[PDB]
Design a protein around this nucleic acid. Structure first.
Ligand code: SF4
Ligand code: MN
Lengths: 190, 342, 98, 343, 98, 342, 343, 218
DNA sequence: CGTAGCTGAGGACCACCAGAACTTTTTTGAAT
DNA sequence: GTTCTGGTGGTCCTCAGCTACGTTTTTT
């Protein structure tokens, strides 16, 4: 009756949008209105836990009732993620993940999302659709498949690899090598 | 990719070490002797009677700063080992690899291949620079024999056999090693690679080099999150932190012996700095030990390249990377551990 | 790149938080480096350690009352540094046989 | 100080361990406080912000006597050792047994037997001293249920069966624990059990005490040489010390829950120093935490006698001793690991 | 040309002529560069002026009692200096309008 | 080959200058605005009632630091001149050449060659990179007119007639210069010449630019060691800095006019910048003065390559180096003095 | 203070100069000392660490008056002037005449006649003062010879011949130079000329004195725009002030030789201030040099009359105005340059 | 030329003429001077050694420094750095002391020994000057170089004297002509202190004609 | 023993205050 | 208006010294 073991952190959802091997490097090898903050949020169908950064509960007639207070409120998510707006949707995944976790907590649907840009100090608005949630479900089940097998994957190095702090552990150059067989025959010849 | 850091050899006896903030302070009956920052000090080595406060031991151990106590003339005592920083999967895989002869013999194959390759090419190079002082032909013949060993070393699957082959690798080289020396053949009375733990001169230096290399390699292996001094390939017979010796077998022939040979050839120390005890043991005078340590560190600082891709690294990083590669072997990155080969 | 940098502070002792800020900045910079002169510390650090030191040290001092300067020389610092007096320094690439 | 098993457990802080001849002398600031021989000692464990004589550590490092240094609170710092003695065999055997399942099942059933024995004896005691206002025949029925738990566990042989039969007793423990609260029962209650964001104050106190005891047991497991992140009952997980949680499931009785109950009773704490923020989590205040830690230290300083050895000691040494016997089980000097048992 | 050079000095005023030495050194060093903190100066010189200043100082102070250090930051001094507090220094290569 | 030291411009009125050691100190009734090291300055331009103690004047004179006084709008209020050096042969040769008409006529040939070439080059560059917004055909026609006149002016041997051709060429060039109103409204249209009164816009900027260029040309000509009061061009009116104008002639085509035009098209200034009293001609403000001086100094740090010398140097070093090329020609080194053909 | 030929002089240090209305005003730390007109002046010469008033400079420069700032000893510091600079045609005419023989020889013969004029009445005056210890007949004979060469050189027009009578007159004056000594003849003796490495005591004095004069007279020409490095009788050579030496000839006797005579006869200086050299040369002493300079400063302050004008002037101002006259000779209505015919 | 003593040239011009013919022209025609690192350090050495009015004797010998010495055969005047007088009954008695002493001239410089004559020339000429004052003959000369802190001996031969006489006459002629020559550039002028003046870069290149005609035509 | 909190006791260090003064040859001096 | 010299005083700066303590639910 230990349901705690099968639950992971939400932040690990980010690293499958960038340098897939980094997730195995950190989580596997273990090497390094109301404006509520720090919400522990868990979801069972997708089986993931985490902490939502900011939730804004806004009063409206057509909202959803909250526990302990009568009425109806929306629970818009706000996350502080610095950087420039980027095409590889590395930050929208965690937004949609926590949004759908909160929605699974209440069994309903919303189509609004807030995000913070610290370096530009920008408000950005994002709706969500089925094309994102299906990809999230597939990515989450594939993550479970990887985690339960204790398997470290291999990915293309890319130009970004001069930025991952694990470049002394990730060892990017061991992707396209001649293998030890070429070393063996070279030492045989010489 | 990492940066090499200093060490710290406390030679004055009756000393004491202490922590203060992030600094190490050297004390001696309530008058300080120095203070050094601890973010550029990758090891601490004590000589004679040294103490340490438990706070210092804890901080160093959990921040990968190896302590080590030696007595008088480099006798090993009481290394300081801290906690287990995790990485259970690598440790479990390593422990599973042991007790099986197949993989153990594979890794032994690679290890002995590295050792013999290094010895052969060092000998060949030596006879290549200056042939007038040596007998070339014999050396050539030895190389041939060593070449044959390669095939046998690769073509075996029992740990007992390779160990026996080790003896041959000893008997083909030891007799030759005598004529490695080019100068002071009378001052430095030399009786081969023959060794005596009580020491008989021109063995004190070799023992010192072995001790320093052993400490460095043990620290390097314990940094990566595994253990290879009592591990899978070498003997289990206790009292011998010698799989670390087995990981530096590819190094003790080159890194320590070549260093000693260059030291002998370049006249860097003379028999004035050595002396002999009444019982037959030999000792090094303090100035000789300081000069030897200076030579050791200055040698460590120099920069070289690597057989893999050509990336620059110093001498001191050669052990550490050789540790890291091993772990990368156990995570399915490489087919087998690619050894150190010049 | 593990380069040399030099840090010089000057904290007013007259205000309400003079003595405490002075003591805390001195002790929070002596950790990372060495004292070559009064109010003049020099150290050998990389980019990340220096960034952490800057962020940690910009809060102890009080602006509009104190001054703090950071000068970075470079990895080839052996040629752009001179000492002429009688307060000798100790380098951190010496083998350090104490 | 010197336990019968060949280890020193010097616990008085500010003590200097020096060597005289072939003997250990404890000095309390320039005065000769204690003397002891070194003929057959196996290990020396020293507490407190203190030191050790360089001659003493050099001498002991030769004859396979590892010296472990822990601070006076219970955190584990260092282990001065020559070539490692009596550790590699223990670690390899631990990993081998972890890969196996039958011996792990035996150890887990022994732990569960200890737990249920402790619970049953505590219930019998509690209905003994205060049979005044409490459901008494229900407690006797629970005692007979715990006896059939005894029987099933001692003849249990499967991992899943062991986990299930462990979980079965947990709920009975939960109701009886809610029944335990006698004094100040009006404001403190155990209507439910909450682990994630513990609702109700008692759950938060339980989590806090569990965290403290888990850290102490982890230090205990590390100071003898056994890895703590590989377990026998629980399965493998990174960042979790499974064997520590096994010893938790054994020892979460007499030493953990009684502390919380005594704190609730005797009017040693009021609800004013407790918070409630939007979900049921109780954010402890600074003064309440200070008092909690002071009470924990005071209880650690209590004096008892070990049921198995029969030698007087303190409570703080109880974890370490237990772990040592576990090591003595894996090294082959003992046949079983009784935490609290007759045998 | 016109490299940036930073000079620091710590003289001993407990000596027989300490006060005189400090006054002379301060006045001599002031003639070439600015002051940013007590006992430190920044100046913009070439090799010729640096040589003249170095000889002046080493003839001015005595050894065995005082200390003096000199640093040269090269031609790119604009992108190597960083300032935090409230003791600004007027640069000598800006348009310089008063 | 020099450093192009910086320059000081004082704008606050009733400012006093003192000298301490080697440092210049600005005072205002015992309140000090700052102090500067004098080993980085070349010129000090005081505005208004700027009193300088005699010691500062002498110190800056003996080390070739020029000090100029302007009241409010860059007039010729005063300069500062020091004592003599050991350049007797240079001044003697300059006077001897000035006495003879013929060498002066070749010098005028070269100056008007610089005139015509720089003017034609600037106008053809203006025409080339610009669409029908500019009068391309008439500009090209004036270019061929100047290209025709340049051969004739290259072989002139009299001063009065050459003055005639340079005057008519100036009128012809002004006939096309009257058009530059591209990116500015009509209030900044050139409407003839106004020597004394800055009656309209632009010309007020022109007067300040002319003063600022002349006060630098004079400083450079004093730097070289030559005496700049006997002109090789114009009638030698007694009591004027003749060679200052003589040399700044060829610079006038690019140094100040092009800067002003670039400013006007870039709209760096606005019509509100200039204010007018009852008549007041046209007056500029403190903000206008600050912006103009900042832009001037910023442009003076630009880097070019000299055509004849073929070397990379700061643009603000045109007037010294150019003047320097004269001094060597006064020793017969070259055959004639080279113009500027940028 | 004193105005002479459309020029203003200031001699007292620490005296500010300002403008009031259309007049110049002398001040001394808020004390008014004098007020003078400005309508007809041409230039202002100052010897004080004053600074003047910036409005005064602006107005004077706008009205074509050049101000010249010097030091309290007579160096050259600065020349603040508008576009006129003062001298353009003056300098160009000077340089044009510098290459022509007849006018240069005229100026030369004026130099010779004036200086030897003055010298021969100096000889006559000293003979009149001291008949007892002086063989006056020889000096009388030399005086008639000097008068004869006066009359003969009054109508000469060749440079080299003038150099010849310079040589003979200098030899005669040397041969009479020995005898004006009257005291401390033991070691203070004159036996020829040694301009380079000085020999035999008194010689050195003269050389040093001469040097000072040059600087002084140099400044004089600097005030009027005359070049101090291009001589008429002397030839132009780099590193030497030819015209300063040319003008210094008349002032050599009274202002240098009479000065050293007044120094020696009063026992102001002795042999203790003269140091010896191994090759026989004579050197100067720091205290001796400072006392010599102090006595020179004391003598510079004496007040005498000007023979050509009659206005009272100090010695320190004599070389300047005379050079001014030479300037007025280049551009002016003066028929001939008036020499310093002083008795 | 008041008494023919005004036509005296400097000893210091000889070395400048020997190295860079225009450098001597620059220093002694147009009166220019610019300083770099080496010349500043050398000047400091000279002023440190320029400490007159004291004498040290060791029983037999004595030293004299900063001697104003002139020679009429070449009509050249200057100041010598040091001359050492040694006790021996061979020379002529000298004023200031008793007995017979012999002279040896030594001068101080800061630099390595030079492949050319250069420096030694000065002492050669120096020797001549001394032989014109004490009425004697000198065939021995002394040098000290500070960069290596080492003492170098030089003999005196008549060929050197004749060469010095020839260059003295040639430089008198140059001075009278007021002529600045041209010399080969080479790698000489990178520490040639007056480098920004005698502009050696412009000599070897083409003249003014073709450049201006080409740029004017196209 | 290590981490903070406060003292206290000398050194470094710069801005003022008051006072006395304020002048000097001609020659050497680098070059990877 | 500058240079140098004593002399004063109030602000930075580090070391020596004495008192009083030492534990926290597990996020990148
Ligand atoms: S830098 Fe490259 S190798 Fe390293 S973690 Fe990132 S993607 Fe992987
Ligand atoms: Mn010399």
């Amino acid at each position: 009756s230990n349901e705690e073991d099968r639950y992971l952190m939400l932040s690990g959802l980010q690293h499958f949008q960038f340098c897939k091997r980094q997730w195995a490097l950190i989580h596997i090898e273990q090497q390094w209105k109301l404006t509520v903050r720090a919400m522990p949020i868990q979801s069972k169908n997708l089986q993931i836990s985490g902490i939502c950064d900011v939730v804004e509960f806004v009063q409206d007639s057509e909202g959803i009732e909250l526990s302990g207070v009568s009425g109806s409120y929306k629970a818009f998510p706000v996350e502080y993620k610095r950087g420039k707006p980027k095409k590889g949707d590395e930050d929208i995944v965690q937004l949609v993940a926590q949004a759908m976790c909160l929605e699974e907590m209440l069994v309903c649907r919303i189509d609004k999302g807030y995000l913070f840009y610290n370096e530009i100090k920008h408000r950005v608005e994002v709706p969500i659709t089925d094309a994102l949630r299906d990809k999230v479900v597939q990515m989450a089940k594939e993550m479970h498949h990887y985690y339960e097998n204790r398997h470290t994957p291999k990915v293309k190095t890319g130009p970004f690899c001069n930025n991952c702090s694990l470049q002394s552990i990730c060892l990017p150059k061991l992707m396209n090598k001649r293998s030890v067989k070429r070393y063996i025959e070279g030492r045989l010849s010489e | 990719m990492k940066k090499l850091l200093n060490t710290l050899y406390v030679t004055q006896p009756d000393t004491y070490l202490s922590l203060d903030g992030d600094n190490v302070v050297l004390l001696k009956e309530q008058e300080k002797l120095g203070r050094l920052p601890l973010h550029n000090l990758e090891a601490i080595v004590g000589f004679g009677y040294t103490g340490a406060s438990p706070a210092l031991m804890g901080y160093c151990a959990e921040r990968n700063i190896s302590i080590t106590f030696l007595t008088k003339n480099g006798r090993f005592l009481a290394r300081v080992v801290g906690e287990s920083r995790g990485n259970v999967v690598l440790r479990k895989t390593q422990y599973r690899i042991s007790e099986n002869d197949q993989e153990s013999t594979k890794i032994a194959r690679n290890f002995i291949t590295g050792k013999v390759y290094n010895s052969k090419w060092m000998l060949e190079r030596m006879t290549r620079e200056h042939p007038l002082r040596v007998n070339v032909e014999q050396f050539k013949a030895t190389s041939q024999l060593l070449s044959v060993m390669m095939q046998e070393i690769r073509n075996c699957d029992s740990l007992e056999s390779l160990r026996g082959w080790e003896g041959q690798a000893a008997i083909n080289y030891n007799k030759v090693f005598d004529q490695m020396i080019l100068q002071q053949k009378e001052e430095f009375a030399f009786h081969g690679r023959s060794r005596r733990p009580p020491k008989d001169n021109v063995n004190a230096m070799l023992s010192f080099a072995y001790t320093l290399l052993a400490n460095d390699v043990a620290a390097a292996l314990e940094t990566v999150g595994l253990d290879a001094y009592v591990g899978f390939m070498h003997q289990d017979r206790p009292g011998r932190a010698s799989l670390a010796l087995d990981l530096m077998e590819e190094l003790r022939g080159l890194y320590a012996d070549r260093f000693v040979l260059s030291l002998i050839n370049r006249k860097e120390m003379t028999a004035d700095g050595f002396y002999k005890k009444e019982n037959g043991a030999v000792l090094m005078t303090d100035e000789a030990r300081k000069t030897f340590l200076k030579a050791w560190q200055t040698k460590k600082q120099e920069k070289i390249t690597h057989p893999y891709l050509g990336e620059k690294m110093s001498w001191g990083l050669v052990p550490y990377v050789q540790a890291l590669l091993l772990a990368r072997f156990l995570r399915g990155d490489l087919d087998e551990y690619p050894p150190f080969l010049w | 790149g593990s380069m040399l940098v030099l840090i010089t502070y000057d904290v007013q002792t007259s205000s309400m938080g003079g003595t405490k800020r002075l003591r805390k900045v001195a002790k929070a910079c002596q950790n990372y480096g060495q004292r070559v002169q009064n109010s003049v510390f020099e150290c050998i650090v990389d980019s990340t350690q220096l960034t952490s030191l800057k962020l940690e040290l910009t809060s102890l001092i009080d602006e509009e009352k104190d001054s703090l300067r950071i000068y970075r020389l470079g990895n080839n610092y052996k040629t752009k540094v001179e000492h002429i007096g009688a307060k000798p320094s100790i380098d951190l690439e010496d083998p350090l046989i104490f």
